[PDB]
Amino acid sequence: GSSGSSGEDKTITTLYVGGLGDTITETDLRNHFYQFGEIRTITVVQRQQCAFIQFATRQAAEVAAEKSFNKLIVNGRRLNVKWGR
Numbered sequence: 001g002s003s004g005s006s007g008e009d010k011t012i013t014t015l016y017v018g019g020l021g022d023t024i025t026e027t028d029l030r031n032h033f034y035q036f037g038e039i040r041t042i043t044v045v046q047r048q049q050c051a052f053i054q055f056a057t058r059q060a061a062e063v064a065a066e067k068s069f070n071k072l073i074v075n076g077r078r079l080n081v082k083w084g085r
Contacts, residue, residue, distance in 0.1 A: 007083050013040065013061040014084035015068060018050040023075050029053060032074055036060040036067075052084055 017029065026044040033039055033053045037060025044051035055061040064072075068081035 009083035012083050013055040013058045015053045016082045016084045019079045020049045033064050036064040
């Protein structure tokens with residue numbers, strides 16, 4: 001089965017995404033996440049090869065979250081996703 005963990009994400013709709021690299025861009029994410037649901041905003045920090053995906057409704061956030069938790073592999077490049085603030 002699963003180990004089972006409880007992070008510190010109660011009503012957080014933002015999701016952090018690292019390991020972007022020049023290879024990966026914003027659009028690639030906007031679409032990869034957009035599928036889950038509306039996207040409030042997307043702040044891609046090149047200096048930190050990361051990006052923050054915000055959702056209007058936690059609903060899409062949660063879904064993408066788990067489906068992103070070290071599971072979101074775009075452009076044959078795994079990405080470390082973690083709940084934001």
